[PDB]
Amino acid sequence: TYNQESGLWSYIFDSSLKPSHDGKQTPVTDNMGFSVITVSRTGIELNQDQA
Amino acid sequence: TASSQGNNNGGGVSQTINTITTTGNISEGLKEETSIQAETLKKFFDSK
Amino acid sequence: SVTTFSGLKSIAPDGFANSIANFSVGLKAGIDPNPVMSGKKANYGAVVL
């Protein structure tokens, strides 16, 4: 998602998406939980002042 | 004559193109370091 | 014995066995809320992982 007030992107990872089994057919057991990565802009952006 | 076609009436409003601080920046077509300035501006225009 | 693909060692932390094939996901655009000088139009970018 992007939020126009914050000017910030939210990246949602859901570990329920992991497959049931490995390439060695071993049950996958770290399939619980999730994580958020927040992206912001850095640097001098276009059209602040004449420069 | 009427072979020009289009609108028979069609009077109304006209507006100039949109603009931003980048509009009219041609800095890659300006200056030189290999050739003559018109030719690098010609390369810069051909893709645009 | 120069290292090649059949012998390259992965320590890849990002959920991939392999450490040679790039990947990318979730391209998203957004308008900067930060004012721009008047008579210039609002800024926008995108990002992708």
Distance between CA atoms of residues A34 and A17, nearest Å: 10
> Contact at 8 Å (CB) between C39 and B19?
yes
* Sheet (strand A2-3) strand order: A2-3, A8-14, A34-39
Looking at residue A27, the DSSP 8-state letter turns out to be B
Elucidation technique: cryo-EM
> Contact at 8 Å (CB) between C46 and C30?
yes
In the complex, which subunits touch A with 3 or more CB pairs below 8 angstroms?
B, C
Residue in chain B nearest C41 by alpha carbon: B20
Query: B43 vs chain A: nearest CA distance in angstroms?
Result: 25
Q: What does residue B15 show for φ and ψ, rounded to 5 degrees?
A: -135, 140
| Element at B29 (helix H, strand E) | none
Query: B38 vs chain A: nearest CA distance in angstroms?
Result: 26
Position of tokens 């290999």?
B34
Query: Which residues on B lie below 8 Å from A47 (Cβ)?
Result: 20-22
Strand-pairing partners, residue C31, are C44
Q: Quick one: tokens of B46?
A: 């051909």
Strand-pairing partners, residue C45, are C30
Q: A44, C28, C30: which is closest to B21 by C-alpha?
A: A44
Please tell me what resolution, in angstroms, this structure has. 11.0
Q: Which of residues 13-42 of A touch C (CB under 8 A)?
A: 23, 37, 39, 41
